[PDB]
Design a protein around this ligand. Structure first.
Ligand SMILES: *[B]([O])([O])[C]([C])[N]C(=O)C1=C(O[C])[C]=[C][C]=C1O[C]
Ligand SMILES: [Co+2]
Length: 466
């Protein structure tokens, strides 16, 4: 009954959406080692977000499932009777889930410690990682968008999903001919506003563009919003994530009865400071839980931060160079043959990344029997599940199929790059598969990926929910 499977997959791959493309397709039985399907298994290809599989496994190996991240607030001495400190530092140590409300609780702690006036300047300290904001070969034109947010040890994460280094811009129509209202979110009073957008007539075409021009911290709004249009919201990155965190903390402090007399900017805790007084701290959830929003929704910021966190753990250097060698070494100690892996970042955003389908499948097998196997598995998108925090990038895929509720797979998505890799756990055995497609020129071959994964569930003896 294997021959029938191979012919079916052969025929799925004959899709006109795969014309000109190269595709690596590997299916292996994890229970009994049997390689069930292999096509260009050792072919080096762009993984896109499948690179997170490698990043996440290494993070669990290096950092541990129980690892958490710290943020603290420091002055050179405690406040006295007057409630006075001079300069004040917000120190970030790589928390990928640090919220505005977390800033408020720390601001309340600063108040409760006795501080009433910050007499000096408030500094945003992110020196735990380096100040290299973007990977070399990432694209300048991607910069305004959440998936290309600058990397920092001190960053504010937005919403349930913890999108870092971004603000939420809301654009609202006014009367026809009047400017549209732009609300810059958290970055109000931080980022600059260039509003050229107008409200068009009721029923007119929505032509609204929100951008952050390259090398600026300006949000430029152009185009038209019709008078009857619903508000438009877009996540847009800011320049210097830590400085926005500093900006938002100054507000948090003010809202908590603490006056800040001086300026806000970047700076590290001076070497001069003999015994920094920690006046507030925050601890994140453990990495096991942080993996969910990271892997379900394919969070690029989380990946790169985790990479540099690895570099800190292995080498005391919050660095891509150290972190990537860290990832490679960790994958080796896990038992993975890293011969075909080129590592240029953690997220897969970089087009300098290469994997092979065999390397992915190799990782899937080695991760499956790891101590952290369940927390790893739990972060993986589950085919056709309506809850975003369960289905993730697979929520609106494979619904009403043998694959719904069973296939746990990671997506990879870019121009001319699409991937689906994970497990097919049937009563027979838990199947592992990697599907990596490069160089298609039309839509992403999702139907091909879905079809294979669905046929793999049917092989593993699953039925479509009805
Ligand atoms: B991964 O391919 O998902 C990651 C590198 N990308 C993004 O987060 C991503 C994207 O960036 C170029 C485009 C579409 C989707 C998406 O992730 C959901
Ligand atoms: Co503000």
């Amino acid at each position: 009954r294997l021959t029938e499977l191979r012919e079916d997959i052969d025929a799925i791959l004959e899709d006109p959406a795969l014309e000109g493309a190269v595709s690596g397709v590997v299916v292996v039985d994890t229970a009994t080692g049997e390689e069930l399907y292999s096509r260009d298994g050792g072919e080096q290809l762009l993984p896109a977000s499948n690179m997170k599989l490698f990043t996440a496994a290494a993070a669990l190996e290096v950092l541990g499932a129980d690892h958490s991240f710290g943020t603290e607030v420091a002055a050179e001495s405690a406040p006295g009777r007057r409630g006075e400190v001079q300069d004040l530092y917000l120190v970030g140590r790589g928390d990928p889930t640090l919220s505005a409300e977390d800033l408020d609780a720390m601001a309340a702690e600063v108040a409760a410690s006795g501080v009433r006036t910050v007499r000096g300047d408030l500094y945003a300290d992110d020196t735990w990682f380096d100040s290299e904001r973007l990977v070399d070969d990432w694209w300048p034109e991607d910069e305004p968008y959440a998936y290309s947010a600058q990397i920092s040890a001190l960053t504010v994460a937005h919403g349930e999903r913890f999108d870092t280094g971004v603000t939420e811009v809301s654009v609202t129509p006014a009367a026809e001919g009047e400017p549209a209202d732009v609300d810059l979110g958290a970055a109000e009073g931080y980022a600059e506003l260039d509003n050229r957008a107008v409200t068009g007539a009721a029923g007119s075409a929505n032509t609204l563009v929100i951008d952050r021009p390259v090398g600026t911290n300006t949000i430029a709004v152009t185009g038209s919003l019709p008078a009857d249009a619903a508000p438009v919201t877009a996540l847009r990155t800011v320049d210097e994530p830590a400085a926005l965190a500093g900006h938002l903390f100054e507000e948090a402090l003010e809202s908590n009865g603490v006056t800040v007399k001086g300026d806000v900017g970047l700076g590290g805790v001076p070497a001069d400071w003999q015994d920094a007084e920690v006046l507030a701290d925050h601890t994140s959830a453990e990495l096991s839980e942080i993996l969910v929003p990271f892997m379900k929704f394919s969070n690029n910021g989380h990946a790169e931060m985790l990479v540099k966190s690895i570099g800190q753990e292995t080498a005391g250097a919050g660095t891509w160079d150290a972190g990537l060698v860290g990832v490679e070494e960790a994958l080796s100690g896990l038992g993975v043959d890293t011969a075909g892996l080129v590592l240029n970042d953690g997220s897969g955003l970089s087009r300098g990344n290469l994997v092979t389908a065999d390397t992915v499948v190799d990782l899937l097998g080695q991760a499956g029997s790891a101590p952290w196997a369940q927390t790893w598995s739990a972060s993986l998108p589950v085919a056709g599940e309506s809850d975003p925090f369960v289905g993730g990038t697979l929520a609106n895929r494979m619904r009403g199929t043998a694959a719904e509720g069973v296939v746990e797979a990671k997506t990879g998505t870019m121009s001319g790059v699409s991937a689906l890799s994970g497990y097919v756990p049937g009563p027979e055995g838990e199947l592992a598969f990697s599907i990596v497609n490069n160089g298609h020129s039309g839509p992403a071959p999702l139907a091909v990926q879905d079809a294979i994964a669905v046929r793999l569930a049917e092989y593993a003896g699953h039925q479509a929910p009805e």
